[PDB]
Amino acid sequence: GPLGSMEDFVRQCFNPMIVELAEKTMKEYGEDLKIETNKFAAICTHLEVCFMYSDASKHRFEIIEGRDRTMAWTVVNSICNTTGAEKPKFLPDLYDYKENRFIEIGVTRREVHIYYLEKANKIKSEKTHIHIFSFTGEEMATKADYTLDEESRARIKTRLFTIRQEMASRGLWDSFRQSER
Ligand SMILES: [Mn+2]
Numbered sequence: 001g002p003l004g005s006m007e008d009f010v011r012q013c014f015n016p017m018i019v020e021l022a023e024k025t026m027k028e029y030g031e032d033l034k035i036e037t038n039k040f041a042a043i044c045t046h047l048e049v050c051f052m053y054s055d056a057s058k059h060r061f062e063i064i065e066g067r068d069r070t071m072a073w074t075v076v077n078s079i080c081n082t083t084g085a086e087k088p089k090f091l092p093d094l095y096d097y098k099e100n101r102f103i104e105i106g107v108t109r110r111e112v113h114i115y116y117l118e119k120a121n122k123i124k125s126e127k128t129h130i131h132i133f134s135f136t137g138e139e140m141a142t143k144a145d146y147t148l149d150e151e152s153r154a155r156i157k158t159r160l161f162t163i164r165q166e167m168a169s170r171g172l173w174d175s176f177r178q179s180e181r
C-alpha cells in the first residue's frame with residue numbers, strides 16, 4: 001500500500017491562494033514546511049475553515065487570519081477604535097460585526113471539549129467567542145452559541161471530513177492525527 005507525501009497532498013488539495021498564505025505564515029514564523037509538513041496541512045486547513053466561516057455570511061465578518069501579523073494587528077486595532085471593542089491579548093481569527101465580537105476558530109484532531117477548554121484558558125477573554133471544529137463532525141462553542149446555522153456548519157464539517165478521507169486514502173491520516181500538539 002502506498003504512502004503519499006503530505007506536501008503533495010497539500011498542494012493538490014488546497015486552493016493556491018490558501019497554500020501561498022500558509023507558506024507565508026510559516027515563513028513569518030520561520031517554520032519549514034518541508035520538515036513540518038503535518039503543520040503545513042493543519043495551517044491550510046485552519047485558513048480554509050476561517051474563510052468558509054466568513055463566506056457563510058457575506059459582509060458579516062472581518063477576516064483577521066491569513067494577514068501578516070503587523071497588518072493583522074493594524075486591522076484589530078482599527079476595529080477596536082471604530083466599534084469600541086476590547087483589544088484582544090492574542091490575534092483572533094475573525095470579527096463578527098453582527099454579534100459585535102472577535103472569534104477564535106479552532107480546528108483539532110484532539111477531543112474538542114479539551115481543545116475548547118485549553119483555548120479558553122489561553123485567550124483570557126470574557127468577550128472573544130470561541131468555536132471549535134474537529135475532523136469527525138464534533139464541535140464546541142462559547143455559551144453553546146454556534147453563530148452560523150446548521151447548513152453552513154455542515155458545509156465546513158463535510159469539508160473537514162473530505163480532507164480526512166483524502167488523507168487516509170493516501171496513508172497520511174495516521175501521522176496527521178497523531179502529530180497534533
Ligand atoms: Mn488565528
Ligand SMILES: [Mn+2]
Nearest residue numbers: 093104105106
Ligand atoms: Mn484559530
